[PDB]
Scaffold this active site. Structure first.
Site, mmCIF file in Angstrom:
data_model
loop_
_atom_site.group_PDB
_atom_site.id
_atom_site.type_symbol
_atom_site.label_atom_id
_atom_site.label_comp_id
_atom_site.label_asym_id
_atom_site.label_seq_id
_atom_site.Cartn_x
_atom_site.Cartn_y
_atom_site.Cartn_z
ATOM 1 N N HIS A 44 0.785 -1.260 0.000
ATOM 2 C CA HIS A 44 0.000 0.000 0.000
ATOM 3 C C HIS A 44 0.803 1.288 0.000
ATOM 4 O O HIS A 44 0.219 2.353 0.117
ATOM 5 C CB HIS A 44 -0.935 0.061 1.209
ATOM 6 C CG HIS A 44 -1.960 -1.014 1.232
ATOM 7 N ND1 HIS A 44 -3.249 -0.815 0.791
ATOM 8 C CD2 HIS A 44 -1.892 -2.298 1.655
ATOM 9 C CE1 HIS A 44 -3.935 -1.934 0.940
ATOM 10 N NE2 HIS A 44 -3.134 -2.850 1.460
ATOM 11 N N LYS B 224 0.669 14.630 0.847
ATOM 12 C CA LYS B 224 -0.658 14.983 0.354
ATOM 13 C C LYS B 224 -0.808 16.487 0.051
ATOM 14 O O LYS B 224 -1.773 16.905 -0.615
ATOM 15 C CB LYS B 224 -1.721 14.517 1.340
ATOM 16 C CG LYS B 224 -1.769 12.999 1.506
ATOM 17 C CD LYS B 224 -2.668 12.607 2.679
ATOM 18 C CE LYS B 224 -2.684 11.122 2.979
ATOM 19 N NZ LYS B 224 -3.512 10.382 1.989
ATOM 20 N N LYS C 54 -14.591 8.496 -3.964
ATOM 21 C CA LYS C 54 -15.832 8.863 -3.276
ATOM 22 C C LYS C 54 -16.409 10.140 -3.821
ATOM 23 O O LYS C 54 -17.624 10.248 -4.028
ATOM 24 C CB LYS C 54 -15.584 9.046 -1.782
ATOM 25 C CG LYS C 54 -15.196 7.749 -1.089
ATOM 26 C CD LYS C 54 -14.684 8.055 0.306
ATOM 27 C CE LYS C 54 -13.837 6.896 0.775
ATOM 28 N NZ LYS C 54 -13.263 7.183 2.067
HETATM 29 N N1 LIG Z 1 -1.563 5.888 1.523
HETATM 30 C C1 LIG Z 1 -2.312 4.722 0.994
HETATM 31 C C2 LIG Z 1 -3.412 5.140 0.007
HETATM 32 O O1 LIG Z 1 -2.891 5.700 -1.209
HETATM 33 C C3 LIG Z 1 -4.277 3.949 -0.385
HETATM 34 O O2 LIG Z 1 -5.418 4.449 -1.096
HETATM 35 C C4 LIG Z 1 -4.719 3.118 0.831
HETATM 36 C C5 LIG Z 1 -5.442 1.833 0.428
HETATM 37 O O3 LIG Z 1 -4.686 1.073 -0.523
HETATM 38 O O4 LIG Z 1 -3.589 2.777 1.639
HETATM 39 C C6 LIG Z 1 -2.918 3.924 2.156
HETATM 40 C C7 LIG Z 1 -1.873 3.476 3.105
HETATM 41 N N2 LIG Z 1 -0.651 3.064 2.787
HETATM 42 N N3 LIG Z 1 0.069 2.724 3.918
HETATM 43 C C8 LIG Z 1 -0.773 2.945 4.949
HETATM 44 C C9 LIG Z 1 -0.447 2.717 6.388
HETATM 45 C C10 LIG Z 1 0.844 2.340 6.757
HETATM 46 C C11 LIG Z 1 1.150 2.131 8.097
HETATM 47 C C12 LIG Z 1 0.179 2.291 9.081
HETATM 48 C C13 LIG Z 1 -1.111 2.667 8.716
HETATM 49 C C14 LIG Z 1 -1.425 2.876 7.375
HETATM 50 N N4 LIG Z 1 -1.956 3.405 4.452
HETATM 51 C C1 LIG Z 2 -11.829 7.293 2.194
HETATM 52 C C2 LIG Z 2 -11.329 7.851 3.515
HETATM 53 C C3 LIG Z 2 -9.894 8.176 3.683
HETATM 54 C C4 LIG Z 2 -8.901 7.987 2.551
HETATM 55 O O1 LIG Z 2 -8.900 9.202 1.809
HETATM 56 P P1 LIG Z 2 -7.655 9.581 0.858
HETATM 57 O O2 LIG Z 2 -8.120 10.873 0.248
HETATM 58 O O3 LIG Z 2 -7.586 8.424 -0.116
HETATM 59 O O4 LIG Z 2 -6.483 9.739 1.807
HETATM 60 C C5 LIG Z 2 -9.432 8.687 4.894
HETATM 61 N N1 LIG Z 2 -10.256 8.887 5.932
HETATM 62 C C6 LIG Z 2 -11.577 8.623 5.899
HETATM 63 C C7 LIG Z 2 -12.421 8.891 7.104
HETATM 64 C C8 LIG Z 2 -12.202 8.089 4.677
HETATM 65 O O5 LIG Z 2 -13.534 7.818 4.633
#
Ligand SMILES: N[C@@H]1[C@@H](O)[C@H](O)[C@@H](CO)O[C@H]1c1nnc(-c2ccccc2)[nH]1
Ligand SMILES: *Cc1c(COP(=O)(O)O)cnc(C)c1O
Ligand SMILES: O=c1[nH]cnc2c1ncn2[C@@H]1O[C@@H](COP(=O)(O)O)[C@@H](O)[C@H]1O
Ligand SMILES: O=c1[nH]cnc2c1ncn2[C@@H]1O[C@@H](COP(=O)(O)O)[C@@H](O)[C@H]1O
Ligand SMILES: N[C@@H]1[C@@H](O)[C@H](O)[C@@H](CO)O[C@H]1c1nnc(-c2ccccc2)[nH]1
Ligand SMILES: *Cc1c(COP(=O)(O)O)cnc(C)c1O
Lengths: 810, 810
Positions: free
Chosen positions: A351, A548, A654
């Protein structure tokens, strides 16, 4: 009231009312004269839950009889949000319950607001897991979510003097009616100890035992009568634990701390022992459960025909050596057989490519905590590196790069390398991300085992993210094309033939305006702030991160302000700029960004010359239930990560679904979204991945942009000089310093193109008909980003199970 | 099956079966094919609970409308035991439920055994509170039990190698269906801080806040449709508590430790801060609740007309200065008015004269923890001592003796002195005890305020302690005299006219033999030991204490053994000597006594020459539910405390009710029991109180008894030389040393008379008809020892409310 909310039959309404009163009396032990809205919510929640349990028992029954292949989704996070309305939607009870509650003199909508979010996640990753569970159930897959029942989820965010304060999310305070404790399936988990080698092989001894008690939550599919299970483990001390007396009892907390609290870091790695304990805890209890369920179908050849384990990032990577430990040490299979089974069983979803998010556990932690697993990891590494050596003889750098063990002052295990080695499939989460995995961080692994590497672009559930949160839009769509799109979102393409229909254009715009009125009212009631609802709703909601680039947004906002002050009497398209999100508690820079956002708000929102032409609002405590309110209200979605950093994004999807246009970079799933809608229907700006690389090769010099762009210079001077912090002139020196000298994410490099692109957005908003026609083109091509599509691809290309839309009997 | 268990109507059985299956499906989420006996217990518990809640709501409703005077029973302990059968008994559902469960193919009796004891008490004091709640509900009093919901009750006792091991009583593991959490009535409790004096008076500031969350448990009265409430508080941290982040969340445990665990000391004071926090916690939350309920009837003149607060020993004594704090600091009454209200409201029951049990809190604890309460205590002391000085001018020793503050290296508060000063009534718990209070420890207080001092002899509920635990005896009694005795136990006197009835003699003896068969079988099934059920069942069950003299019993047991070995071929009445009870974890001597008991057992039970003529059994984990099994099985009750040490005793009363004869000293309520039955129907032995005093005056020399009694000398030599501990010859040197040189309880002084009296018991047991006639004379005069009598006396002579036997509507 509306079609997609289902039938409200006389008998069905009568029976819900009857059961509402039965639960109020017997379950809650309240009379009508003392019941609060909280009591009424609970009475309703118990009545709806009753409609699940027949289906739940029947579904689990069915899986026992048919014995299909079973999917285990292991995650440390499940960001579920509220369960009540989602349960009603999926059981077609929403209109009946609304009618039933109405006749009792209650407003269901205000009862819904009392439910606490289950915030057992940080953001995208946790939410993906929740969306996936919904899609798995909707597609009839025999799937189980396995995680940790944290007592405290993602912290509640308060803003105090423009700064984030954290407070504990005590979500279980009032009870969770959705869960069922199953103390009878409590399992032991082992920690510490040491390894003895006998003639009968290795033996893990002198361990500390922690008990894992499961809690089951139903996961209903969409109108198919399938109810799957999310099983979350809770840490409990054994009764002989520490067993002067009083203190021994009080010290039971040391063991139960394992499940106490969610680590609140998004896309960042903190190598703490408690975190590693959480990871082993969920893995160990889950695998015993998997194996037990499997043995009720001593021959493990068929294990991968009956079991798929999906690893949600590296967080449950210990499933790999744990599965080996069980098969080799306890079941006494030979190593090579056990390894075959393990690889065929496990699959890994990556991810993130940000290096600070990659899990690299120090060997001394693993050695102390999980000494047997470390031995198994070394053995895995040796045999893996022997395959690399044989495929690439003499390439000693490759051996060093690919090792699971990385050398340095601190030796570490690279858990991503473990996952790749021990899984038959490795996937990224959007096409550009999966390509980046093959070209950069896992290039070596791709060269060895090209067959492992796949893409599975993320999705969102259209149940929560359209029907539930935006009923008015769901309804006007259903007026024209029917209801089948809700579980077959590709059908939204049929909306392209209404792009020139004046009635539909008017309805799409009316729903957007209604959502904005409703959200503007919500802002005034719950947080005493006035919003012009005729303005463009420019929203960036997501966790606060440097990558971001909420800062880039901040720079645009200050640019619009400076332009207004320069030419006060020129027309400008009014905007409400809303930014929301939580910063990780120890992420200093993310906390400063929040403070900057509110500081800008303090200047902009109180300038008489600005009027209602520009408002900057920090949306407090951004969570799933706030996303359900603000996303339907949005006109412009801000997806402005530096190219190559956002693995996928899901907020982006979304907003596309709910009638907002997107301004964003060619990053993550934005690339596929633009490709689906057409680039002309998307506000694309900035560096591509290739441009970022070129800029890195020659070196990113931010001073160059500061020297060449007067508008940018002015902003940096305002920040430095105390324009936005008069009482603390140097408050934002760290932000300036970072932007000028240590900006990993090249904010200035995209500034000029972003502001120009934001001008085109404003121009289009002046022409409502063409704005709304572009919106229709977005909504109509958002079908690919259903998590039903995503899960069907996992099922066919990784798990080897066929999805199904067919109903179980009711 | 039997009359007193109520009707089993066809419709009532049909409805219970229906609701059993409804709870199994909807509440437990189980099908019939996977349900365990635990599931069936829970399904039954939920079906029975449903029959409470209508009455519960209706009763609390009734008290709101009628607004009677309300009784608040504050205790740190409520030893409730199991709730299921007691609830069935009191609702007349026992036969219907037995029939309903039978038709579903289930045995209710085995489901009953699955319920965990609520062990929120140590022994007598905690059980008295439970018995009192039952009697209050049965007598229609608007009464509330207020205490602490400890997560861990009195520890479970395991015997390992003849030693007590403790393990945590995790009684909530599987859930408590009887309780209802009421998070909506959560209240703040304050600790630490400091006192500011303003012009507006004293102000307690900078405090640590702990939240008290109440859980309510129904307390049904006997067949009167009255259901009262036991409200137990649980400690919860506020959400801003400690609010790096993770650690702050983990540190919430420091606050929640307050309600974590019951202090396991019976009749002993441990001055620990956590204990004092528990005492303030229950007092503070309870008084806010009292006051809130009162203000729904700003004038506190009528407070004592609407409120009685009964203090169960000194454990909630802080209610006195807390009530003052609220009235003076918050409500702004003047001191003298507040004091009038407080004294008229509060009443204190003393439960012990042993000096090591008296609560004397160090001033430095109170100063740190409750600085305002310490100020108020000093002010109370000053004004109290001014009254003493005026009544007894010049008696400066009296002033020192009566002070609430005692001087010494450590200054302490004498909490008993506080209770006497701040209460309108002070009572002991048996006539001899109440006399001892007036003649010794509170003589000074009695001389000042003779009117305060009362007796309220203890009692036991005949619902639990006859109908519930001994249905066969309840039935044969009901055959002759009807069922009214169950709530009017004085009616048992009518059994004196059946003392020469051959049928009744036979039935009384048959029931005893049936109880013994059933208990002998229970011993074999659950703990693999064989018991001759034709033997006399000699039982001593109660907490392990030096003052209760389990050692005296041990000496008799070894005497019987030595006599058998001396003359092996002489007839001896066979006995099973059963001793059971828990030792406090830090009470070394009590732990040694347990070890001696099991050591004697190891020698005696394995001597071929003894045969089945003498068995010594240590009954493991003595708790309320084991008392319900063994007391009906007993022939001889051992109540052998040194005269003047057992305040009352209540085990004594349970045995009298259930057809056992008593061997005991003239101590506690034994004196009143013998007086009711006639001394000729009681095995009285040993020193009276007066004899103990005489022996103290000249000095207790144990050597004298050792020198004069050869049989006693031999036992002490056997103990010393390793006869009972061959592998550790000196294992019991501490016991011998104590008995010879430091015996506060004069074991040897009563040895000779005890053994002679035990000979008379054996002689009478040889004549079953006369044994059983004596038993009838005991059972028939046990009416006085109903807690209904006790509570009616509290109500009329202390609380000023009239009891009632009349039914609420159903
Ligand atoms: N930033 C991405 C997003 O781009 C992605 O949409 C999401 C689901 O694939 O995963 C997120 C994510 N990637 N690493 C984490 C993460 C890593 C460590 C702890 C908690 C979350 N979350
Ligand atoms: C969908 C969602 C996210 C992920 O949003 P990104 O714009 O992809 O970072 C984070 N927080 C909440 C509460 C969501 O519903
Ligand atoms: O021996 C059995 N007989 C009938 N059904 C069973 C048996 N074992 C498991 N099941 C079913 O499958 C179970 C699902 O839970 P699991 O044991 O976690 O897979 C139960 O809820 C039953 O519905
Ligand atoms: O305002 C009211 N109207 C009607 N009944 C009330 C009101 N306030 C309290 N009660 C009743 O008394 C309460 C008993 O709980 P208490 O508040 O702890 O005394 C409720 O359960 C109601 O039955
Ligand atoms: N020993 C008496 C018994 O004789 C008496 O029958 C019982 C109830 O009055 O109270 C017991 C009792 N007295 N003090 C305690 C006590 C003191 C401190 C902590 C726990 C219990 N218990
Ligand atoms: C009644 C009872 C006691 C008190 O017994 P005494 O002989 O009065 O000490 C102690 N423990 C339990 C479990 C009881 O039921």
């Amino acid at each position: 009231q509306i079609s997609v909310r289902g039938l409200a039959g006389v008998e069905n309404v009568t029976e819900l009312k009857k059961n509402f009163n039965r639960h109020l009396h017997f379950t809650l032990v309240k009379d009508r004269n003392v019941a609060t809205p909280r009591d009424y919510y609970f009475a309703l929640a118990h009545t709806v839950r009753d409609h699940l349990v027949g289906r739940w028992i029947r579904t689990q029954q069915h899986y026992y009889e048919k014995d299909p292949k079973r999917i285990y989704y292991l995650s440390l996070e499940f960001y579920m949000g509220r369960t009540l309305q989602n349960t009603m939607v999926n059981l077609a009870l929403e209109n009946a319950c609304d009618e039933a509650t109405y006749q009792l003199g209650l407003d269901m909508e205000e009862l819904e607001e009392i439910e606490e979010d289950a915030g057992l996640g940080n953001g995208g990753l946790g939410r993906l897991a929740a969306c996936f569970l919904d899609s798995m159930a909707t597609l009839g897959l025999a799937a189980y979510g396995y995680g940790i029942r944290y007592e405290f989820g993602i912290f509640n965010q308060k803003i105090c003097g423009g700064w984030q304060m954290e407070e504990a999310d005590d979500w279980l305070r009032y009870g969770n009616p959705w869960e069922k404790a199953r103390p009878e399936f409590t399992l032991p988990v082992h920690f510490y100890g040491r390894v003895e080698h006998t003639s009968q092989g290795a033996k893990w001894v002198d361990t500390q035992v922690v008990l894992a008690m499961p809690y089951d939550t139903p996961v209903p599919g969409y109108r198919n009568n399938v109810v799957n299970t999310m099983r979350l483990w809770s840490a409990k001390a054994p009764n002989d634990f520490n067993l002067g007396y009083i203190q021994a009892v009080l010290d039971r907390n040391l063991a139960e701390n394992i499940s106490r609290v969610l680590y609140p870091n998004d896309n960042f790695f903190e190598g703490k022992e408690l975190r590693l304990k959480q990871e082993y805890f969920v893995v160990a209890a889950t695998l015993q459960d998997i194996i037990r369920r499997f043995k009720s179908s001593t021959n493990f050849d068929a294990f991968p025909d009956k079991v798929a384990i999906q690893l949600n990032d590296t967080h449950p990577s210990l499933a790999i050596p744990e599965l080996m430990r069980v098969l080799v040490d306890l079941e006494r299979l030979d190593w090579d057989k056990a390894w075959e089974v393990t690889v065929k069983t496990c699959a890994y979803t990556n991810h993130t490519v940000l290096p600070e998010a990659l899990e690299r556990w120090p060997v001394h932690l693993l050695e102390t905590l999980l000494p047997r697993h470390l031995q198994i990891i070394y053995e895995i590494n040796q045999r893996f590196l022997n395959r690399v050596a044989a495929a690439f003889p003499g390439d000693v750098d490759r051996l060093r790069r690919m090792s699971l063990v990385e050398e340095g002052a601190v030796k570490r295990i690279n858990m991503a390398h473990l996952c790749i080695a021990g899984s038959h499939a490795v996937n990224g989460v959007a096409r550009i991300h999966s390509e980046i995995l093959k070209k950069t961080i896992f290039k070596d692994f791709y060269e060895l085992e090209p067959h492992k590497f796949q893409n599975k672009t993320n999705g969102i559930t259209p149940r929560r993210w359209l029907v539930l949160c935006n009923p008015g839009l769901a309804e006007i769509i259903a007026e024209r094309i029917g209801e089948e799109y809700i579980s077959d979102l590709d059908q939204l393409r049929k909306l392209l033939s209404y792009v020139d229909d004046e009635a539909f254009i008017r309805d799409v715009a009316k729903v957007k305006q209604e959502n904005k009125l409703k959200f503007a009212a919500y802002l005034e009631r719950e947080y005493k702030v006035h919003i012009n609802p005729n303005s463009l709703f420019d929203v960036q909601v997501k966790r606060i991160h440097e990558y971001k680039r909420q800062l880039l947004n901040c720079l645009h906002v200050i640019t619009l302000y400076n332009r207004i002050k320069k030419e006060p009497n020129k027309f400008v398209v009014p905007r409400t700029v809303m930014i929301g999100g939580k910063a990780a508690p120890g992420y200093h820079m993310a906390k400063m960004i929040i403070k900057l956002i509110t500081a800008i708000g303090d200047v902009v929102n109180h300038d008489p010359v600005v009027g209602d032409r520009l408002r900057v609002i920090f949306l407090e405590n951004y969570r799933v239930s706030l996303a359900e309110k603000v996303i339907p209200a949005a006109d412009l979605s801000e997806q402005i990560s530096t190219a190559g950093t956002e693995a996928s994004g899901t907020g982006n999807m979304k907003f596309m679904l709910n009638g907002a246009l997107t301004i964003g970079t060619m990053d993550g799933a934005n690339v596929e979204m633009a490709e689906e809608a057409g680039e002309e229907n998307f506000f694309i700006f900035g560096m591509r991945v290739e441009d970022v690389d070129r800029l890195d090769q020659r070196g990113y010099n931010a001073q160059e942009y500061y020297d060449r762009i007067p508008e940018l210079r002015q902003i940096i001077e305002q920040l430095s000089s105390g324009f936005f912090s008069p009482k603390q002139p140097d408050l934002f020196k760290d932000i300036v310093n970072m932007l000028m000298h240590h900006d990993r994410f090249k904010v200035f490099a995209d500034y000029e193109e972003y502001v120009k692109c934001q001008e085109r957005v404003s121009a289009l908003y002046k022409n409502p008909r063409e704005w709304t026609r572009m919106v229709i083109r977005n909504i109509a091509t958002s079908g690919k980003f259903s998590s039903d599509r995503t899960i069907a691809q996992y099922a066919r290309e990784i798990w080897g199970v066929e999805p199904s839309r067919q109903r179980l009997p009711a």
